[PDB]
């Protein structure tokens, strides 16, 4: 009864109904580092300006 | 300070936009007007300073210096316009521009509330001064004089810049008021010793300290008359004023760090007074006498007493006026005989009687004859030194003796004796020259009536 596959059928991506659970951490990854805290708040002008030496602005 | 600074800045557009023949008239009129305005800074307070803005302030130390600068500008203009009569209009305007720039820089230097701003303004004074000396000086020696003055000052000043920024990074401020109110004692370590040296050496070389003074004869001799006037009168005082300001962060390290400088100045005042006894150049003799008075100022600042600071302030003011007068008096003879050799033109009292009188007044003030403010400053410093150590009276008495000797020797050799036979071009004194001497001498004597105006903030 064996029909021979046509051109392109054997190259298809198919799906398989497996019973195996999906691996959780296939890379055996460490915990990722905590990120640097983000920037919050509204911009206020520099207190007393640049404060570079004798400059007042 | 803007009511003083902005009029001075306005001298430049006015100078450059005035007619070719109204240059001296306009500059003189409006610089005298600015000097009138600067007198209102002498209204000082007993305790606080005049803190106008965040960037400029005035106290009893800097107000007489500001008045001296604003007064020196017009006298400069009267002294210059003779030897610069043959110059081009643009070049005269450039000379006036240099003088105005110097005055503006000095005005902001003496009122800068911040140490780094003071540093930049005090360094800025080099540029017009160097330009004046090297471009409008008379001899080939003006170039070497300019190099000496520039590089002595800069070798002094750059370590001061490093020390100032280090102090700002460690203390947080270079503000004079903050520096005083947050004063920390200075510990005894090599780090602090070299911080002291960096903070002190620029003002030391500026005064100048004996041994670091070899630029001053060159520069004050080779410069044109206005350049010599400013160099002797206001530029030397930058070292004393800066030293008085910055010694408030150097204690108690100054107690023993001052010993080499105290020794150097106490002996070098003797050394340079003796040099004056043998100087064959009149302008060089006058230049060498500045070293002794400035050595006295050095001692006064280094011993750190209220009386020493009062005397140093008064002495700086009086020396400015007297040294500028002496340079002008020598220049009047130089413009006649075209030479600075002192025994060239002798017996001048029988040719220029009122100029001989001006010479006698200048010599008497250089003598520190009482009750002149020269004597007040010298005597206050001498008393403070006597308290510091009684043995100081030997050296200071020797110095006042030698000072008398060389001052009166200069007077006698130039004014007295027999006139030179072959010198037949001693024309009568112009109204301008007599007015120059009178405007030098009259405010000097009037200060004796109100001596507290020049006794500094410790009065
Ligand atoms: C058109 C005008 C329209 C108008 O109505 O404007 C009103 C407008 C109102 O502004 P404001 O903030 O309400 O009032 C001013 C504040 O009360 C007072 O100022 P502030 O509190 O707003 O602060 C301004 C700020 C920021 O200011 C700056 O960054 C700029 C500094 C100057 C600004 C003002 C003048 C600018 C325009 C004129 C430029 C003339 C240059 C001449 C150069 C001569 C060189 C020898 O200053 C600082 O942070 C530090 C000031 C001190 C350091 C200055 C720079 C030091 C480094 C360079 C050293 C070399 C010497 C000094 C500089 C050169 C001049 C000698 O005022 C002005 O336009 C004038 C302001 C004058 C400030 C003077 C500060 C002292 C130093 C300069 C004085 C000597 C130069 C002569 C200046 C005056 C004659 C030209
Ligand atoms: C109770 C305690 C004491 C309290 C008061 C203290 C007062 C001082 C005491 C100590 C004084 C010791 C030294 C005395 C003088 C020794 C040398 C001398 O006799 O020279 C004569 C000589 C002028 O007479 P000359 O030699 O016959 O004139 C020849 C002329 O070629 C041709 O003259 P002419 O015949 O054509 O006639 C014109 C002559 C008219 O004058 C004279 O003939 C002489 C006037 C002498 C006045 C009194 C002596 C000086 C006192 C104050 C200094 O005037 C001039 O030549 C121009 C002079 C312009 C400036 C004058 C001095 C500043 C204003 C006046 C101040 C008084 O020079 C002076 O008078 C200048 C003396 C400068 C001394 C050095 C400074 C020391 C500290 C003074 C502080 C004063 C503060 C209070 C007054 C502030 C006024 C702005
Ligand atoms: C002398 C004979 C008597 C006179 C009359 C009596 C009163 C008297 O003497 O008063 C004197 C008075 C002070 O003595 P007084 O305290 O007796 O004054 C009396 C008036 N009451 C009571 C209101 C105080 O002093 C003066 O008049 C002298 C002024 C000296 C300063 C002059 C500045 C001129 C600046 C021109 C430019 C040059 C600046 C050079 C650098 C300067 C740096 C600071
Ligand atoms: C080029 C030819 C040679 C030039 C001279 C040699 C300069 C360098 C030699 C060493 C100077 C001394 C020094 O390094 O002082 C360091 C001192 C302390 O600062 P820090 O190093 O931070 O240590 C703090 C405590 N842990 O620093 C301080 O306390 C601040 C000092 C800042 C300015 C230092 C300037 C040099 C030292 C003074 C030199 C003498 C004065 C100038 C004379 C003319 C030059
Ligand atoms: C051509 C030169 C032009 C000028 C160049 C620059 C200026 C000169 C050099 C400046 C730098 C000098 C640095 C001195 C640092 C001294 C540090 C020190 O230890 O000071 C503390 C010390 C205390 O001694 P002590 O006996 O403990 O006191 C009694 C309580 N025990 O007390 C002392 O140490 C006091 C100081 C002693 C050493 C100097 C004494 C003066 C001698 C004359 C010096 C002249 C300058 C030239 C020298 C050339 C050599």
From TrEMBL, chain A:
Known role: Accessory subunit of the mitochondrial membrane respiratory chain NADH dehydrogenase (Complex I), that is believed not to be involved in catalysis. Complex I functions in the transfer of electrons from NADH to the respiratory chain. The immediate electron acceptor for the enzyme is believed to be ubiquinone.
GO biological process: mitochondrial electron transport, NADH to ubiquinone
GO CC, any one term: mitochondrial intermembrane space
Keyword Calcium: no
Record's keyword terms, sorted: Disulfide bond, Electron transport, Mitochondrion, Repeat, Respiratory chain, Transport
Protein name: NADH dehydrogenase [ubiquinone] 1 alpha subcomplex subunit 8
Family: Belongs to the complex I NDUFA8 subunit family.
Region entry Disordered, spans: 18-49
Residue window of the full protein shown: 192 to 248 of 248
Subunit structure: Complex I is composed of 45 different subunits.
Cell compartment(s), UniProt: Mitochondrion intermembrane space
Composition-biased stretches (Basic and acidic residues): 31-45
């Amino acid at each position: 009864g064996w029909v021979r596959p046509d051109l392109g059928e054997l190259s298809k991506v198919t799906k398989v109904k497996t019973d195996r659970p999906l691996p959780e951490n296939p890379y055996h990854s460490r915990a990722r580092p905590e990120p640097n805290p983000e920037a919050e708040g509204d911009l206020k002008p520099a207190k007393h300006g640049s404060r570079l030496f004798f400059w007042t602005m | 300070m803007l009511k003083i600074i902005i009029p001075t800045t306005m001298l430049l557009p006015m100078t450059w936009m005035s007619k070719h023949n109204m240059i001296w008239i306009n500059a003189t009129v409006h610089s005298l007007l600015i000097s009138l305005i600067s007198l209102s800074l002498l209204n000082q307070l007993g305790e606080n300073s005049l803190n106008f803005s965040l960037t400029f302030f005035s106290d009893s130390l800097s107000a007489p210096l500001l008045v001296l600068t604003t007064w020196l500008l017009p006298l400069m203009l009267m002294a210059s316009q003779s030897h610069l009569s043959k110059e081009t209009t643009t070049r005269k305007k450039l000379y006036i521009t240099m003088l105005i720039l110097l005055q503006l820089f000095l005005i902001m230097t003496f009122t800068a509330t911040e140490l780094i701003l003071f540093y930049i303004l005090f360094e800025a004074t080099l540029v017009p001064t160097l330009i004046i000396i090297t471009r409008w000086g008379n001899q080939t020696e003006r170039l070497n004089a300019g190099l000496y003055f520039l590089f002595y000052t800069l070798a002094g000043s750059l370590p001061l810049l490093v020390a100032l920024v280090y102090i700002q990074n460690t203390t947080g401020s270079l503000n004079f008021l903050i520096i005083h109110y947050w004063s920390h004692p200075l510990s005894n370590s090599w780090s602090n010793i070299f911080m002291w040296l960096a903070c002190i050496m620029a003002f030391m070389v500026k005064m100048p300290l004996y041994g670091l003074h070899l630029w001053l004869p060159k520069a004050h001799v080779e410069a044109p008359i206005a350049g010599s006037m400013v160099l002797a009168a206001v530029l030397l005082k930058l070292g004393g004023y800066g030293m008085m300001r910055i010694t408030t962060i150097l204690n108690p390290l100054t107690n023993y760090m001052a010993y080499p400088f105290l020794m150097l100045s106490m002996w070098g005042m003797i050394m340079t007074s003796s040099i004056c006894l043998r100087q064959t150049d009149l302008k060089s003799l006058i230049a060498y006498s500045s070293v002794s008075h400035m050595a006295l100022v050095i001692v006064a600042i280094m011993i750190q007493t209220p009386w020493s600071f009062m005397g140093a302030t008064a002495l700086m003011i009086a020396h400015g006026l007297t040294s500028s007068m002496l340079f002008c008096l020598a220049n009047t003879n130089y413009e006649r005989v075209h030479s600075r050799t002192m025994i060239l033109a002798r017996g001048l009292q029988t040719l220029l009687p009122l100029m001989a009188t001006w010479w006698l007044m200048a010599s008497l003030t250089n003598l520190a004859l009482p009750p002149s403010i020269n004597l007040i400053g010298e005597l206050f410093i001498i008393t403070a030194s006597f308290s510091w150590s009684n043995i100081t009276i030997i050296l200071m008495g020797m110095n006042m003796m030698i000072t008398a000797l060389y001052s009166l020797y200069m007077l006698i050799t130039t004014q007295r004796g027999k006139y030179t036979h072959h010198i037949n071009n001693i024309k009568a004194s112009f109204t301008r020259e007599n007015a120059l001497m009178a405007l030098h001498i009259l405010p000097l004597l009037l200060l004796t009536l109100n001596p507290k105006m020049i006794l500094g903030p410790l009065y």
